[PDB]
Design a protein around this ligand. Structure first.
Ligand SMILES: Nc1ncnc2c1ncn2[C@@H]1O[C@H](COP(=O)(O)OP(=O)(O)OP(=O)(O)O)[C@@H](O)[C@H]1O
Ligand SMILES: Nc1ncnc2c1ncn2[C@@H]1O[C@H](COP(=O)(O)OP(=O)(O)OP(=O)(O)O)[C@@H](O)[C@H]1O
Ligand SMILES: C/C1=C/C(=O)O[C@@H]2C[C@@H](CC[C@H](C)C=CC=CCC1)O[C@@](O)([C@@H]1CSC(=O)N1)C2
Ligand SMILES: C/C1=C/C(=O)O[C@@H]2C[C@@H](CC[C@H](C)C=CC=CCC1)O[C@@](O)([C@@H]1CSC(=O)N1)C2
Ligand SMILES: [Ca+2]
Ligand SMILES: [Ca+2]
Lengths: 335, 335
């Protein structure tokens, strides 16, 4: 009788029940095979047999529930292929015997989580980053921007820029330690030059970090150079535009009537948007690219690591959404 | 048993019951379709399927009455085509099953609202402006003047002349805010030059306006330059004559016997004639174009936004009008 909510990400899987304040299970999207394998790449499901192993683990190992006794709400990256979605549905009704289910757009859920039907979302995960403009609940597809740059790319870059300081983070076990640092110490510098100049002249921006084996290490400008890649992807050999630019482009690809409201509603989702000082930066950067008379506003909610999941827990619980489910009868009938 | 009164305008629909002091329902003449659509353009019905949706909303959503249980009084712009009127009647007797109905000339009703049978009306709405000379209740058709310039054109012009001051009113949602300003602050300058000179030298004619989002803005000469378009339509690329001129022309196109009485009875109807200082202007301007010995007088009633509706509420209630109804029997007989 209780509905579920399964947010499948490139890095993590955030699962729980609809109506809850937060997901009860949060675990890696991996499958070890000597060795590990991420079945979701850039927010898209690449291996299906593996993906079933994840959903199987979700229901039975994590949530400890019968999948046929609960309607399940699955999530999907924006502009997800139709053959990709139809393949999910099939697996839920046939392999996991679900009584009903539905596939919602991750970014759209994050908007609802904020309490908004209309707005331009920025969802940066571990595998992919998206600019999704939404009007009256419908995400405008021709305006959506994609960017294959997220936390994992950022974690890798940090490892690299720590290697020039004399450190040796190469193995995958060590990569997690560099992820922890990235999450713990890093921040988004309001101005890059000014900050680098503070780092060159003083040691005020330096921070100590205790490694698993007790030893302490220090990091200076890496704190903000790493997340800077988001605004300048060319730092890692990417000729793509920054997040401020792709956000601007996204808005300009919409109708002129809604732009005022998109600018005024810049929601931020995904753990990669958790960098301290990212809101002050996106305000600054956007303000410049856009007109002078435009009111810009960035909304960065404290629990934006789980805005997608929270968005589905609300949606699943809504009265208006109940009709939009897909019963096994409907599927076994209409396909 | 109670009669209705439905004033259909290009911008608004003013509906209510006959005998009432004012209409109970006042709503936009729009139909959204992703987006909005004004079925009445320049006071004339262009889309009939939409217009039915408006009348349907009027009866059932707004007035909450059965159309077959009440005789309905509909309004029409002057010089409305006969095929236009015959199409209205058909829709009322056949689609809305009315027991009776009648189609009256908007401007003529406004005259009755003032308490006059003979006089030259000026009715400026949101979509069209008309000079209608009326004698003993009959509006003289060959003398009627039309002008495709009203509040909406005026609202658009104001947006434009606010853009030179540095503001950015472009979208349709913002257009309503510029309409509010137009209605709130604007006025008709007795003399244009003198006023512009006051604006160039001092800041006494400036007025602050609180925008929906709290921020305040200032407007100076736009207050009177916007409504000035009425006296000089060339401001917006219209080679047509002003309202003072078309009013003069209208009077000269009549018989010489009634001119004295037309001049002495210049009634003003429609929301566009609500600009403060428009009466002092029309007096001045007309006085000049006309002879010296002529007694000019402008009548601008406080409730002239609803003079057309009020005119029909009185007419529907009159004893002499009762015979002029059109019974469904009469129609289903004579067509
Ligand atoms: N405080 C933090 N600062 C910066 N990054 C963080 C922080 N906490 C978590 N992250 C990063 O956020 C990412 C996880 O976010 P999320 O779970 O939304 O992504 P995902 O759903 O796994 O992948 P995607 O959404 O791209 O498919 C990881 O890369 C993680 O390192
Ligand atoms: N105080 C005001 N000053 C100036 N204009 C006003 C004021 N109040 C309303 N208006 C304008 O008057 C118009 C509405 O008047 P009205 O309802 O008579 O027109 P309509 O019947 O919708 O159109 P039409 O009569 O031309 O077919 C709108 O353009 C509105 O902006
Ligand atoms: C607290 C935590 C958060 C997380 O997001 O991990 C996810 C999942 C993780 C799987 C592989 C590692 C060894 C196993 C385990 C771990 C537990 C989850 C770790 O691979 C990431 O680290 C990658 C690599 S580096 C990066 O940025 N993304 C993202
Ligand atoms: C208080 C009010 C008066 C009015 O007259 O509105 C009418 C109707 C309105 C319909 C479209 C808007 C968005 C929706 C709603 C509104 C409520 C009615 C607003 O479009 C006008 O604004 C046009 C545009 S600008 C102008 O001058 N005429 C005239
Ligand atoms: Ca995600
Ligand atoms: Ca009217």
């Amino acid at each position: 009788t209780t509905a579920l909510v399964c947010d499948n990400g490139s890095g993590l899987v955030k699962a729980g029940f609809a109506g809850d304040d937060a997901p009860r299970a949060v675990f890696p999207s991996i499958v070890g095979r000597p060795t590990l394998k991420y079945p979701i790449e850039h927010g898209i499901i690449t291996n299906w047999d593996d993906m079933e192993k994840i959903w199987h683990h979700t229901f039975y190992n994590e949530l400890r529930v019968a999948p046929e006794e609960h309607p399940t709400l699955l999530t999907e990256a924006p502009l997800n292929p139709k053959a990709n979605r139809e393949k999910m549905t099939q697996i839920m009704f046939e392999t996991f015997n679900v009584p009903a289910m539905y596939v919602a757009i991750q970014a759209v859920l994050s908007l609802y989580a904020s309490g908004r039907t209309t707005g331009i979302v920025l969802d940066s995960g571990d595998g992919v980053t998206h600019n999704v403009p939404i009007y009256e609940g419908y995400a405008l597809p021709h305006a959506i921007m994609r960017l294959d740059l997220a936390g994992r790319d950022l974690t890798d870059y940090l490892m690299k820029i720590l290697t020039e300081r004399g450190y040796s983070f190469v193995t995958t076990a060590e990569r997690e330690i560099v992820r922890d640092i990235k999450e713990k110490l890093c921040y988004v510098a309001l101005d890059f030059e000014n900050e680098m100049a503070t780092a060159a002249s003083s040691s005020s921006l330096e921070k100590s970090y205790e490694l698993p084996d007790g030893q302490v290490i220090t990091i200076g400008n890496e704190r903000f150079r790493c997340p800077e890649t988001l605004f300048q992807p060319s730092f890692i050999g990417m000729e793509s535009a920054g997040i401020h630019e792709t956000t601007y482009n996204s808005i300009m690809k919409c109708d002129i009537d809604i732009r005022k409201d998109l600018y005024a509603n810049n929601v931020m989702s995904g753990g990669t948007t958790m960098y301290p000082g990212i809101a002050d930066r996106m305000q600054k950067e956007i303000t410049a690219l856009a007109p002078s008379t435009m009111k810009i506003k960035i909304i960065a909610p404290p629990e934006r690591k789980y805005s997608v999941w929270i968005g589905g827990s609300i949606l699943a619980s809504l009265s208006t959404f109940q009709q939009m489910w897909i019963t096994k009868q409907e599927y076994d009938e209409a396909g």
